[PDB]
Amino acid sequence: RPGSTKRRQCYPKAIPECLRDSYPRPDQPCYLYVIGMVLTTPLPDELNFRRRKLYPPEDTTRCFGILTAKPIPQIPHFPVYTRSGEVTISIELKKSGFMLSLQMLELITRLHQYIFSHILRLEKPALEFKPTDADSAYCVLPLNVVNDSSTLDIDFKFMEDIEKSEARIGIPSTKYTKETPFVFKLEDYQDAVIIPRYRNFDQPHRFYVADVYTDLTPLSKFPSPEYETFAEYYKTKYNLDLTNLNQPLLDVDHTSSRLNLLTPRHLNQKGKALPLSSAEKRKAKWESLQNKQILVPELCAIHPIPASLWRKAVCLPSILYRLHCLLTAEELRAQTRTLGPNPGLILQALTLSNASDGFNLERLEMLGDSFLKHAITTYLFCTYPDAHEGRLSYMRSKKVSNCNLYRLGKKKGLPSRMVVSIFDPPVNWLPPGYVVNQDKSYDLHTEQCIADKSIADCVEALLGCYLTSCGERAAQLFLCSLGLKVLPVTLNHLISGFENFEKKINYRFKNKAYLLQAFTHASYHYNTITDCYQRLEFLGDAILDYLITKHLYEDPRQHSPGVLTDLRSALVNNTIFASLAVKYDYHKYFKAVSPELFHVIDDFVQFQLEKEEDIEVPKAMGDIFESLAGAIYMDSGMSLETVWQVYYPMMRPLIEKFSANVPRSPVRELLEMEPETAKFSPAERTYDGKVRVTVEVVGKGKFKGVGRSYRIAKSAAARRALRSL
RNA sequence: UGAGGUAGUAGGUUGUAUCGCUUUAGAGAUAGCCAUACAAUCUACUGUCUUUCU
Ligand SMILES: [Ca+2]
Ligand SMILES: [Ca+2]
Numbered sequence: 030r031p032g033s034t035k036r037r038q039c040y041p042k043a044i045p046e047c048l049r050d051s052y053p054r055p056d057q058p059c060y061l062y063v064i065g066m067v068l069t070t071p072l073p074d075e076l077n078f079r080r081r082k083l084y085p086p087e088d089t090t091r092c093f094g095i096l097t098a099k100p101i102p103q104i105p106h107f108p109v110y111t112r113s114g115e116v117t118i119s120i121e122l123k124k125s126g127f128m129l130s131l132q133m134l135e136l137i138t139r140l141h142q143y144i145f146s147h148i149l150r151l152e153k154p155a156l157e158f159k160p161t162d163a164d165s166a167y168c169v170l171p172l173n174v175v176n177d178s179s180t181l182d183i184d185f186k187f188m189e190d191i192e193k194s195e196a197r198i199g200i201p202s203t204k205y206t207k208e209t210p211f212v213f214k215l216e217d218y219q220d221a222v223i224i225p226r227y228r229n230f231d232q233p234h235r236f237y238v239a240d241v242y243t244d245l246t247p248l249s250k251f252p253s254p255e256y257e258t259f260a261e262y263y264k265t266k267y268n269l270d271l272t273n274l275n276q277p278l279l280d281v282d283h284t285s286s287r288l289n290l291l292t293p294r295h296l297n298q299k300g301k302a303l304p305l306s307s308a309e310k311r312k313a314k315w316e317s318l319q320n321k322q323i324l325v326p327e328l329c330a331i332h333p334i335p336a337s338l339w340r341k342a343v344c345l346p347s348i349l350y351r352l353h354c355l356l357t358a359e360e361l362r363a364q365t366r367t368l369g370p371n372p373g374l375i376l377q378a379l380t381l382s383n384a385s386d387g388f389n390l391e392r393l394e395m396l397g398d399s400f401l402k403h404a405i406t407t408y409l410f411c412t413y414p415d416a417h418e419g420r421l422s423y424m425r426s427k428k429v430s431n432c433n434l435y436r437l438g439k440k441k442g443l444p445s446r447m448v449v450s451i452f453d454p455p456v457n458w459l460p461p462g463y464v465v466n467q468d469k470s471y472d473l474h475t476e477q478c479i480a481d482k483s484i485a486d487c488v489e490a491l492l493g494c495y496l497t498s499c500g501e502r503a504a505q506l507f508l509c510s511l512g513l514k515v516l517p518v519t520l521n522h523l524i525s526g527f528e529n530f531e532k533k534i535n536y537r538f539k540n541k542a543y544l545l546q547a548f549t550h551a552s553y554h555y556n557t558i559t560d561c562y563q564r565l566e567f568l569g570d571a572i573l574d575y576l577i578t579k580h581l582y583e584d585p586r587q588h589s590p591g592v593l594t595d596l597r598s599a600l601v602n603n604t605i606f607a608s609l610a611v612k613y614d615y616h617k618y619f620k621a622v623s624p625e626l627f628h629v630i631d632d633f634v635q636f637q638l639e640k641e642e643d644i645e646v647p648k649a650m651g652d653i654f655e656s657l658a659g660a661i662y663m664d665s666g667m668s669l670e671t672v673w674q675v676y677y678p679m680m681r682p683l684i685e686k687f688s689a690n691v692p693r694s695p696v697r698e699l700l701e702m703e704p705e706t707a708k709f710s711p712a713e714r715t716y717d718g719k720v721r722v723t724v725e726v727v728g729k730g731k732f733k734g735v736g737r738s739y740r741i742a743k744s745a746a747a748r749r750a751l752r753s754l
Numbered sequence: 755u756g757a758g759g760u761a762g763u764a765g766g767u768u769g770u771a772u773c774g775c776u777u778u779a780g781a782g783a784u785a786g787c788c789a790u791a792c793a794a795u796c797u798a799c800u801g802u803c804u805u806u807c808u
Contacts, residue, residue: 034768079755100783113757225807233785234807252808262808294798298765300777308800315801322808381769385797398787422777426785452796550756570776594787598775693789697774701790704772711781738783 032431032484033065041476044165045357048461051097052166055131062095063172063181064348066341070108070115076295076304078312079241079497081282083113088440089337091184093345094123096168104356105373109347110293111340112285116352118348123172123181128285133185140188141168145460148334149231149288153455153468160462165353165425167461169345171338190610196330200226200233211327213275215241216281220336225330227267236322237336241281247274250323262564263328283338289452290347291354291386300387324559346454349461355379355446365367365507370498378491380448381483390483390490393497395590397489399578400496400504404515405429406571407667410564411518418563428513435486437511439529444484497582501669515555520619521560531619534657536675538664547660548619548653556620566652569659574601577674580684593690599692600683604642608634609679610654619653641748642694702726702754709743722746724753729753 030036054058066086077083083282086092099122108115129137138160146152160166173184195201204614221238228234250259260524261280263269264743297303308315334342355361359372361379369375380388382439405428409421416424427433437445457473459465466474488511496504509516527544533538538544542559581593588596610616611631627647658672665671700707703726710723719735722742732753736746 228807236755250808259808286755289797296797296798303764305800310800320808324808381766382794385766389766395787402786407756419778422785423779426777430785453797459757567777591788594775595789598787601775601776694774698791700773704791708772709781 032433032481032485036481037478038481039476039478040444043442045353046360046508046537047099047101047356047357048165048167048353052160052163052462053098053134053137055134055537056128057098057130057155058126059096060100060122061096061127061172061181061183062097062101062120063123063637064095064341064578065119065121066092066344067119068114069117072114078316079112080313080316084337084340085113086116086341089624091171091173091187091338091341091448092181093338094170094172094181094183094590095120095343096170098167100125101352101357102359103360104352105687106357107351107373109290109344109351110292111344115293116344120352126738128229133183136185136188136192137168137170137183140170140191140493141462141649143191143197144169144342144345145462148339149454149460150347151158151455151458151460152284152347155466155477156459156463156474158462159464162464163462164465165459165461169349169461194333197333205327207270207271211271211276212726213273213276213326217331218326218728221282222284222332222334222336222339223279224328224332225324225329227263227269229329230681231278232433235284235332236281236324237284237339238279238630239282239336241277242280242323244276245280247271247276247278247280247327250278251318252323258569259325260467263325269328273327276326278323279326280327282324283322285298285343288343288346288454290344291351291452293387296678298385298387299389331450340409340548346458346460347452347686350452350454350458354448358446361446365495365510366503367499370494374494374498375491376448377495379443379446379487381479381487383451384448384450388401388446391494391590392587393544393594394486394489395493395593396497396578396582397493400487400501401429401508401513401574403571403575404505405510405513406568408515408518410568415684416564418567421564421567431482431485434488435481437513438488440486440510441488442477444489447479447483447487469684504586514726524555527618530614533613533668534675536661536671538660540664543660543664544657547656550621550649553620553622561654562656564655565659565663567659569655570601570655572662572669572672573655573658573676576603576669576676577680577684581688584688586688595691595693596687598694599640599681603648605683606652607646608638609651609683610650611635615653615657616650619649621649623647695751696744696746699726699751699754702751709746712739712742724750726754730741 068083068087070679071083071085072722104112106115106117106119109531110116141160142158146158152158164271171184171187172181172185175184176182191197210740218238218241222235223238224235225231246257256262260271260274263271276445277531292298295304295382332339341551356372357377359375361370362369362375377388377390377393380386381390402425405425409416409424413421452458454460459474466472473636492507493506495507505515524541524545525643527541545556546559547562547565548560549556549559551563574597577597578593581596583589611627611634616627616631627650630644630647630650633644658676661672661675662668706725706727708724712722715721715735717735720737720742721733721737724732724743724746729750732746732750734742734749736742736745
């Protein structure tokens with residue numbers, strides 16, 4: 030089926046244009062940037078129980094810098110959620126227009142390989158480092174302040190002590206004797222990443238140092254109580270001896286092994302702050318009594334990389350993917366006005382749920398459903414001077430089906446730019462400077478499969494974001510650019526008396542004829558001066574839905590689309606429209622040949638409600654209450670604000686009752702009280718001339734209600750059943 | 755913050771069955787938006803258990 034959720038198809042991953050053809054070249058200008066980490070949201074000690082110090086990225090002065098051959102356009106300050114709290118990352122230029130030589134540039138490239146292959150462990154048999162066939166390639170090099178304090182410059186005395194050390198890829202060859210006892214230097218291990226030598230010869234385990242335990246010595250650690258001392262442990266399990274028995278033990282904690290840092294660990298998947306209320310004493314006791322690795326400096330080789338830069342390196346996958354999460358492919362916004370929405374907002378008009386990062390596609394597309402319906406409806410109602418409700422409902426439903434929405438999103442190119450998968454850097458991320466998967470002589474490193482429904486939903490969320498930001502001219506221009514055309518959008522013996530009603534509603538009509546149209550049938554032909562109240566019911570149902578949805582969206586209560594649509598249906602049900610049209614006296618001006626239809630419900634409501642239904646609901650009472658809205662709208666130069674001004678006094682107590690009482694239909698609530706045994710019997714005409722429905726739930730007998738149709742009959746039966754429960 | 759497994763919570767996702775509301779074409783049908791119950795599956799957190807590391 031063309032727009033079915035089932036029809037999945039395969040789609041590649043687009044490359045931000047700035048991050049392609051981006052390899053630095055000899056005698057080619059570079060653009061040195063800076064990641065710009067600054068810890069502007071520490072974590073609280075009422076929220077952190079690691080029992081471990083916080084490390085701001087400002088304690089030290091060496092930082093990572095991209096070296097694209099292409100200029101990066103400034104991106105909104107985005108956060109990453111490291112061990113030390115929400116870090117606001119800012120990729121802001123540091124220097125530009127300088128030329129490098131060959132030797133230093135090959136040094137840069139070798140350090141880039143060392144970083145992604147050796148440091149981050151993103152090397153797989155399938156992936157081969159080729160920075161000349163790769164599709165996204167740029168160096169990631171360290172920066173420091175030397176000479177002038179203001180200047181940040183490429184470290185060359187660093188990146189040259191990585192080529193003069195032999196503890197980088199292997200373990201240094203060293204010889205310790207009892208005649209030259211091992212000597213300890215505190216400054217060397219102050220910020221150190223240490224690798225154990227006695228084990229994991231294939232792939233060693235890295236751990237940055239975070240403390241020095243001075244009281245702890247090689248003779249008293251006893252961590253696992255089956256061993257007489259610490260030194261005897263290396264001696265029996267590895268047969269290693271120590272030449273210095275007065276050195277301290279070197280407390281230590283792992284390098285981060287999971288490199289998805291775009292989500293917070295102790296908050297919801299909603300962007301909502303929520304600390305846990307359980308294990309409060311236990312979390313502190315946990316990191317206290319838990320086994321913790323206490324290495325020894327004798328046997329651990331110090332990397333040529335200090336912890337202060339390893340900490341900025343670990344965050345490079347997430348930072349280089351969020352900068353890549355179309356933040357730099359804001360070409361969508363360049364193609365699409367008050368300067369457009371923030372690229373942070375457009376990244377919620379491309380992110381689909383089950384991408385689990387803190388943005389949902391929905392709660393922004395529901396508002397898009399109401400505007401597109403309203404825009405299509407208004408465009409039709411004014412495109413043609415004559416069309417019955419059947420024709421317009423036909424035309425509309427074709428221009429707004431999921432099939433057509435899908436066929437318009439994919440034509441734009443929206444499926445590659447989307448975010449459909451969860452971020453796993455080793456499994457489905459292709460790091461920069463790496464050529465697409467092959468080493469073996471469909472793939473998860475450059476393709477993804479998305480349903481046809483999801484393109485049709487993002488085409489809605491994008492409209493929602495442009496709308497809620499730039500107004501209602503921007504949403505219309507956006508749709509018009511997709512392809513959906515929305516932009517080119519005796520008679521004084523029964524008209525006198527409308528002055529009282531106009532004074533009741535506090536609006537005066539520039540042309541009274543619209544009030545007349547809003548009150549005459551398409552079968553009552555005594556009034557031939559004006560047209561039927563049928564086209565107006567169409568515009569008014571769309572508008573009163575758009576306005577109610579915009580109000581509901583603008584509330585700080587932040588309703589999920591489920592509750593939002595439940596409310597929208599709770600107040601646009603035509604029973605309420607009948608009640609509000611008879612309360613404020615719409616019927617007394619309403620010319621019709623209805624014999625006794627609305628009189629019963631009028632007396633019913635005016636007697637019982639003096640501050641569910643036991644009587645039939647007139648179609649007219651419900652449809653005049655919302656043809657008046659269309660009449661105001663079409664009279665007041667197509668202005669939603671006069672309509673909302675006139676209608677908000679009436680609807681205000683109703684809205685502030687329903688946004689707290691959130692009503693629902695008796696049939697659905699019955700099938701939610703017990704769906705196992707509840708079912709409606711097929712229609713069958715009784716001896717009254719009615720239609721009856723037989724309903725049962727076990728234990729309370731059988732229920733029924735006669736009506737003029739199957740829907741009304743089962744509704745009455747459901748009410749009868751639900752009153753007893 | 756080593757590789758797993760097993761329960762719960764939170765956020766999703768897929769399929770299937772019963773369904774609500776708005777629109778109307780001539781049990782029920784067209785086109786939109788949810789909810790509910792069962793099942794499969796993924797991510798983040800907490801605890802518990804095995805292995806490893808200290
Ligand atoms: Ca939709
Ligand atoms: Ca209607």
